[PDB]
C-alpha cells in the first residue's frame, strides 16, 4: 500500500547550489513532475510519450545523463529509448539516440527547471492538462507548463 516507490515527500538533498548543476546528480534517475496539472512524465515502450499522476509506475524512472555544459541526454529505463522531438511537434522515443534527443536545460529563479528543445530552441517541452502531450507548436512562454521539478530519487 506504500504509495510511490521509496516514499518521497518534499525535500532538498544537496543544498550546496552555489552555481548551477555540475556533474554529481546525473548518477541516479530523476522523476519529471510537471507542476501544471500535476503530471509525471512517462515514456511508454511503444514510444507514445504521455504524463500520468500514478507515481507508482516504475516506467517514470527516466535515466538522465549530463553530456556537455547545459546539455543533458534523457533516457528511459524500462522503455530503454531516448526521447526525441520531431520537426512537426510529435514527441516520441527510439533506441538509437539522435541530435534531436538533446534538450538545453535552464534553471529559473523559482526552483523550477525548464527544458528547451535544441534543433528547435523556438519551442520548449510541455505536457497538456489532460495528461496528453502538448504539440511543440502550442508550447511557448506565458504557459507555466515549462515549470518542471525533476526530483532525484536519492533516498
Swiss-Prot record:
Inactivated after 3 minutes at 60 degrees Celsius or 1 minute at 80 degrees Celsius. The modification Phosphotyrosine is found at residue 82. GO terms for cellular component: cytoplasm; extracellular region; extracellular space; nucleus. It is found in: Secreted; Nucleus. Changing residue 55 to E: No effect on integrin binding. Its main location: secreted. Changing residue 134 to E: Reduces binding to integrin ITGAV:ITGB3 and suppresses FGF2 signaling with reduced ERK1/2 activation and reduced ability to induce DNA synthesis, cell migration and angiogenesis. Acts as a potent antagonist of FGF2-mediated angiogenesis. GO terms for biological process: angiogenesis involved in coronary vascular morphogenesis; animal organ morphogenesis; behavioral response to ethanol; branching involved in ureteric bud morphogenesis; canonical Wnt signaling pathway; cell migration involved in sprouting angiogenesis; cellular response to mechanical stimulus; cerebellar granule cell precursor proliferation. Residues 128-144 are annotated as: Heparin-binding. A motif (Cell attachment site) lies at residues 46-48, 88-90. The record marks 128-129, 134 as: Important for interaction with integrin. There is a cross-link at residue 95 (Glycyl lysine isopeptide (Lys-Gly) (interchain with G-Cter in SUMO1)). GO terms for molecular function: chemoattractant activity; chemokine binding; cytokine activity; fibroblast growth factor receptor binding; growth factor activity; heparin binding; histone H3K9me2/3 reader activity; identical protein binding. Changing residue 53 to E: No effect on integrin binding. Expressed in granulosa and cumulus cells. Expressed in hepatocellular carcinoma cells, but not in non-cancerous liver tissue. Keywords: Angiogenesis, Developmental protein, Differentiation, Growth factor, Heparin-binding, Isopeptide bond, Methylation, Mitogen, Nucleus, Phosphoprotein, Secreted, Ubl conjugation. Phosphorylation at Tyr-82 regulates FGF2 unconventional secretion. Retains almost half of its activity after treatment at pH 2.0 for 3 hours at 20 degrees Celsius. Heparin binds at residue 36. It comes from the Eukaryota. Monomer. Homodimer. Interacts with FGFR1, FGFR2, FGFR3 and FGFR4. Affinity between fibroblast growth factors (FGFs) and their receptors is increased by heparan sulfate glycosaminoglycans that function as coreceptors. Interacts with CSPG4, FGFBP1 and TEC. Found in a complex with FGFBP1, FGF1 and FGF2. Interacts with FGFBP3. Interacts with integrin ITGAV:ITGB3; the interaction is required for FGF2 signaling. Interacts with SNORC (via the extracellular domain). Interacts with glypican GPC3. This protein binds heparin more strongly than does aFGF. Belongs to the heparin-binding growth factors family. Acts as a ligand for FGFR1, FGFR2, FGFR3 and FGFR4. Also acts as an integrin ligand which is required for FGF2 signaling. Binds to integrin ITGAV:ITGB3. Plays an important role in the regulation of cell survival, cell division, cell differentiation and cell migration. Functions as a potent mitogen in vitro. Can induce angiogenesis. Mediates phosphorylation of ERK1/2 and thereby promotes retinal lens fiber differentiation. This is Fibroblast growth factor 2. It comes from Homo sapiens (Human). The chain holds residues 134 to 288 of 288 of the full protein.
